Amino acid sequence: MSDLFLELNGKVHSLSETFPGLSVQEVSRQSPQLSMETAEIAGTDGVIPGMTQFKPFIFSAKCNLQALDIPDYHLAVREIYEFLFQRDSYYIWSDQMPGIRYEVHPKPVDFSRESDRVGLLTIEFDVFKGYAESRGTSLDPMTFEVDLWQMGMNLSNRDDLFYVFRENTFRVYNAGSDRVNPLMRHELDIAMTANGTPTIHNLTTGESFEYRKELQKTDVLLLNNIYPLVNNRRVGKDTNHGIITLEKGWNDFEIKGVTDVTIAFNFPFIYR
């Protein structure tokens, strides 16, 4: 059995459950739209590729609606149109792969009336970020009872994966298919509490974030995307304005200038 789940206004709605007469036949996903920024020099052969990018793509769901009678059919069509089309983008996922969700916007799709009570539909959701992300962030535990993780999410079956560290040198595993960069509108949060003047170094990437003031254990330093704060107060003037990024796989992190470090990473995995 196939079904489609929609996250809207903080509520999860099953498409089949919401509309009893509507059942999802099949789901499908367009392949990533790779595009190399070609540059052509006249007289030479081929192109000089720039930086490969990914265009928005389409997630499709073929379904059918079976109503009791004609007024019921029209009412169901209107209610489905009301439910699907909202002002802002929402989230969708499928039973087949319940660990991966897409932030999407609906597309105009017309009901194909086959009989007096049945109508075929092929809903298409445009995903504009160009990638899919996990339903849960890195802060969620990798436990069975959380009911969030599934197979095929590049989870390493060779070592434990935790995202809270108590020492000055450790490794963090980004399981996504893209390098997590807040400059690319990626979600990434770091919460560190320690004593002294801190400096975070990502050795594999080679990046370094530097804060130039003394810190106490009671003050939390929070880097969200491209904003560093202490106690939710912007302190960008007192930093080196550097930002760390998470490469694919393992990243070696070293923290200098502080003691009793407690650093936590909170970011979703980027799939495609």
């Binding site: 920024e37 540059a39 020099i41 000089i48 720039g50 930086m51």
Partner: protein, 126 residues
């Protein structure tokens, strides 16, 4: 100036005896170009094999994928440059005439004192 050697060097500075040329290159290489470096230009179909000194750069962002435009031996004509030249010449002429109005008024002012001197001398002579 009064001597002839200064006039000769001034006259030499006053004319241009070579064609006025301006070179523009669309560069799409990996090596960045700074504002001081002198490059070597080789372009057989246009008969170029020389050293070129950068005088103008129109660079894009490193993530913008776009080409770079680099200039040598001054820039193309353009109209806004001509308008700026005309405007600054107009301003210079305006300040010149403003100064010379006061200068002429002083020349009138400097006349009355000498008129008084002439009158006093005429009275003394009588």
């Amino acid at each position: 100036i009064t001597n002839n050697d200064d006039l000769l060097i001034f006259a030499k500075k006053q004319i241009l005896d070579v064609p006025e040329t301006a070179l523009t290159i669309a560069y799409k290489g990996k090596e960045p170009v700074s504002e001081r470096d002198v490059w070597y230009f080789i372009h057989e179909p246009m008969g170029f094999e020389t050293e070129v000194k950068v005088t103008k750069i129109k660079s894009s962002h490193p993530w913008s994928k776009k080409f770079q435009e680099i200039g040598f031996s001054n820039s193309r004509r353009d109209m806004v440059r001509i308008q700026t030249q005309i405007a600054n010449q107009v301003k210079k002429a305006s300040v010149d005439t403003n100064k010379i109005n006061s200068f002429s008024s002083i020349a009138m002012n400097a006349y009355d004192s000498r008129i008084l001197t002439e009158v006093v001398g005429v009275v003394d002579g009588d």
